[PDB]
Scaffold this motif. Structure first.
Motif, PDB file in Angstrom:
ATOM      1  N   UNK A   1       0.773  -1.251  -0.112  1.00 41.17           N
ATOM      2  CA  UNK A   1      -0.074  -0.054   0.022  1.00 41.17           C
ATOM      3  C   UNK A   1       0.996   1.259  -0.051  1.00 41.17           C
ATOM      4  N   UNK A   2       0.188   2.364  -0.225  1.00 46.26           N
ATOM      5  CA  UNK A   2       1.099   3.637  -0.151  1.00 46.26           C
ATOM      6  C   UNK A   2       0.618   4.708   0.895  1.00 46.26           C
ATOM      7  N   UNK A   3       1.439   5.831   0.908  1.00 45.50           N
ATOM      8  CA  UNK A   3       0.769   6.814   1.792  1.00 45.50           C
ATOM      9  C   UNK A   3      -0.648   7.312   1.738  1.00 45.50           C
ATOM     10  N   UNK A   4      -0.966   7.351   0.164  1.00 44.18           N
ATOM     11  CA  UNK A   4      -2.356   7.636  -0.317  1.00 44.18           C
ATOM     12  C   UNK A   4      -3.414   6.780   0.193  1.00 44.18           C
ATOM     13  N   UNK A   5      -3.200   5.426   0.847  1.00 44.65           N
ATOM     14  CA  UNK A   5      -3.987   4.958   1.376  1.00 44.65           C
ATOM     15  C   UNK A   5      -4.263   5.020   3.079  1.00 44.65           C
ATOM     16  N   UNK A   6      -3.261   5.684   3.262  1.00 41.25           N
ATOM     17  CA  UNK A   6      -3.417   5.955   4.822  1.00 41.25           C
ATOM     18  C   UNK A   6      -4.592   6.736   5.360  1.00 41.25           C
ATOM     19  N   UNK A   7      -5.220   6.413   6.416  1.00 42.73           N
ATOM     20  CA  UNK A   7      -6.538   7.175   6.937  1.00 42.73           C
ATOM     21  C   UNK A   7      -6.040   7.654   8.437  1.00 42.73           C
ATOM     22  N   UNK A   8      -6.786   8.301   8.968  1.00 40.96           N
ATOM     23  CA  UNK A   8      -6.547   8.792  10.266  1.00 40.96           C
ATOM     24  C   UNK A   8      -6.805   7.821  11.515  1.00 40.96           C
ATOM     25  N   UNK A   9      -5.724   7.698  12.313  1.00 44.79           N
ATOM     26  CA  UNK A   9      -5.243   6.874  13.329  1.00 44.79           C
ATOM     27  C   UNK A   9      -4.924   5.509  12.626  1.00 44.79           C
ATOM     28  N   UNK A  10      -3.728   5.186  12.446  1.00 45.75           N
ATOM     29  CA  UNK A  10      -3.089   4.408  11.719  1.00 45.75           C
ATOM     30  C   UNK A  10      -1.780   4.054  12.314  1.00 45.75           C
ATOM     31  N   UNK A  11      -1.718   3.724  13.516  1.00 48.18           N
ATOM     32  CA  UNK A  11      -0.364   3.857  14.495  1.00 48.18           C
ATOM     33  C   UNK A  11       0.535   2.719  14.027  1.00 48.18           C
ATOM     34  N   UNK A  12      -0.004   1.501  13.204  1.00 47.53           N
ATOM     35  CA  UNK A  12       0.953   0.593  12.840  1.00 47.53           C
ATOM     36  C   UNK A  12       1.182   0.700  11.454  1.00 47.53           C
ATOM     37  N   UNK A  13       0.158   0.889  10.733  1.00 51.10           N
ATOM     38  CA  UNK A  13       0.225   0.866   8.826  1.00 51.10           C
ATOM     39  C   UNK A  13       0.914   2.112   8.485  1.00 51.10           C
ATOM     40  N   UNK A  14       1.093   3.215   9.302  1.00 52.07           N
ATOM     41  CA  UNK A  14       1.867   4.466   8.710  1.00 52.07           C
ATOM     42  C   UNK A  14       3.559   4.315   8.783  1.00 52.07           C
ATOM     43  N   UNK A  15       3.916   3.066   9.660  1.00 51.73           N
ATOM     44  CA  UNK A  15       5.319   2.666   9.798  1.00 51.73           C
ATOM     45  C   UNK A  15       5.774   1.729   8.805  1.00 51.73           C
ATOM     46  N   UNK A  16       4.769   1.297   7.982  1.00 50.08           N
ATOM     47  CA  UNK A  16       5.094   0.210   6.976  1.00 50.08           C
ATOM     48  C   UNK A  16       4.657   0.498   5.612  1.00 50.08           C
ATOM     49  N   UNK A  17       4.598   1.705   5.339  1.00 46.72           N
ATOM     50  CA  UNK A  17       4.191   2.097   3.690  1.00 46.72           C
ATOM     51  C   UNK A  17       5.447   1.474   3.007  1.00 46.72           C
ATOM     52  N   UNK A  18       6.689   1.594   3.170  1.00 45.82           N
ATOM     53  CA  UNK A  18       7.669   1.073   2.407  1.00 45.82           C
ATOM     54  C   UNK A  18       7.482  -0.748   2.374  1.00 45.82           C
ATOM     55  N   UNK A  19       7.400  -1.086   3.334  1.00 47.40           N
ATOM     56  CA  UNK A  19       7.580  -2.707   3.212  1.00 47.40           C
ATOM     57  C   UNK A  19       6.154  -3.484   3.309  1.00 47.40           C
ATOM     58  N   UNK A  20       5.116  -2.973   3.477  1.00 50.56           N
ATOM     59  CA  UNK A  20       3.895  -3.419   3.447  1.00 50.56           C
ATOM     60  C   UNK A  20       3.689  -4.189   4.658  1.00 50.56           C
ATOM     61  N   UNK A  21       2.572  -4.884   4.728  1.00 50.57           N
ATOM     62  CA  UNK A  21       2.251  -5.916   6.010  1.00 50.57           C
ATOM     63  C   UNK A  21       1.641  -7.217   5.572  1.00 50.57           C
ATOM     64  N   UNK A  22       1.710  -8.148   6.360  1.00 47.13           N
ATOM     65  CA  UNK A  22       1.005  -9.366   6.036  1.00 47.13           C
ATOM     66  C   UNK A  22      -0.476  -9.322   6.631  1.00 47.13           C
TER      67      UNK A  22
ATOM     68  N   UNK B   1      -8.976  -1.232   6.501  1.00 51.00           N
ATOM     69  CA  UNK B   1      -9.653  -0.848   5.477  1.00 51.00           C
ATOM     70  C   UNK B   1      -8.733  -1.727   4.262  1.00 51.00           C
ATOM     71  N   UNK B   2      -7.433  -1.907   4.480  1.00 46.66           N
ATOM     72  CA  UNK B   2      -6.789  -2.817   3.763  1.00 46.66           C
ATOM     73  C   UNK B   2      -7.384  -4.400   3.877  1.00 46.66           C
ATOM     74  N   UNK B   3      -7.712  -4.736   4.860  1.00 47.09           N
ATOM     75  CA  UNK B   3      -8.314  -6.261   5.224  1.00 47.09           C
ATOM     76  C   UNK B   3      -9.625  -6.291   4.551  1.00 47.09           C
ATOM     77  N   UNK B   4     -10.508  -5.073   4.618  1.00 46.07           N
ATOM     78  CA  UNK B   4     -11.775  -5.083   4.021  1.00 46.07           C
ATOM     79  C   UNK B   4     -11.841  -5.081   2.582  1.00 46.07           C
TER      80      UNK B   4
END
Length: 264
Positions: free
Chosen positions: A69-90, A108-111
């Protein structure tokens, strides 16, 4: 008597309080406004993770699959996902973030992976919940407008749904255990139901907070040597501030404990 106590608690909150308590030893339940709709806010994320696990059970998803995902996908209160824009997440990391820290982008990503709010609602219908519905994405689903059926559950429906997901046969035994483990690791609920419970109780929970003075907590509680109890608490339209609303939910927890230890 518990209903009487909850009505008094509701009165001083200035809002509308909904509670269900489901004793899995018997399947019996006590509810206050158990069949009224309340906004879920982030409590839906427990159900989202269950739906994802059902897909894993079906061979349609993997917990170790990488989501980018990219920074464009971030919405408010994303304390974990905001740290992993570069590497994504499982998928598993996203479920963990969504449940234990209420990360909104993770939800949202899981949805998106699941197929959207309608896919989550369809999953709930498939396990027998005819009430609960998700309609919107984060952060819009937290509007919590009175009279708006979008993104709502009832305390009783949610309690029955938690029971069948965490303790019933809706998920594989491995997936059930995973969902329990995530809820037990929740970090956002220390001032809510957990604050009213005995220290020796094992607790899994998911919080929610929203507009119109909304504070929620849903939990499964394992008292020592006892069958677990499911407790759902929805508070909305409340006139007291956020910390006071937390204390209202903590008081529900205390009242429930008192009811089970002194035959109320």
């Amino acid at each position: 008597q518990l209903s009487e106590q909850l009505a008094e608690l509701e009165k001083r909150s200035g809002g509308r309080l909904g509670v269900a308590v489901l004793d899995t030893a018997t399947g019996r339940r006590i509810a206050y406004r158990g069949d009224e709709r309340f906004p879920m806010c982030s409590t839906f994320k427990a159900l989202l993770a269950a739906a994802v696990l059902a897909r894993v059970d079906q061979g349609k998803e993997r917990l170790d699959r990488r989501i980018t995902y990219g920074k464009e996908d971030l919405v408010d209160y994303s304390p974990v996902t905001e740290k992993h824009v570069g590497d994504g997440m499982t998928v598993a990391e996203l479920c963990e973030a969504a449940i234990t820290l209420s990360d909104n982008t993770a939800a949202n990503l899981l949805l998106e992976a699941l197929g959207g709010p309608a896919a989550l609602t369809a999953f709930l219908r498939s396990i027998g919940d005819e009430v609960t519905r998700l309609d919107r994405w984060e952060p819009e689903l937290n509007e919590a407008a009175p009279g708006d059926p979008r993104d709502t559950t009832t305390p009783a429906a949610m309690a029955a749904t938690l029971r069948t997901l965490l303790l019933g046969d809706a998920l594989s035994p491995a997936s059930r255990q995973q969902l329990v483990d995530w809820l037990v690791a929740n970090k956002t609920g220390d001032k809510r139901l957990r604050a009213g419970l005995p220290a020796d109780d094992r607790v899994g929970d998911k919080t929610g907070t929203g507009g119109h003075g909304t504070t929620n907590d849903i939990a499964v509680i394992w008292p020592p040597g006892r069958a677990p109890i499911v407790v759902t608490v929805y508070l909305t339209e409340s006139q007291v501030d956020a910390d006071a609303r937390d204390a209202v939910i903590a008081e529900v927890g205390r009242l429930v404990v008192e009811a089970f230890h002194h035959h109320h």
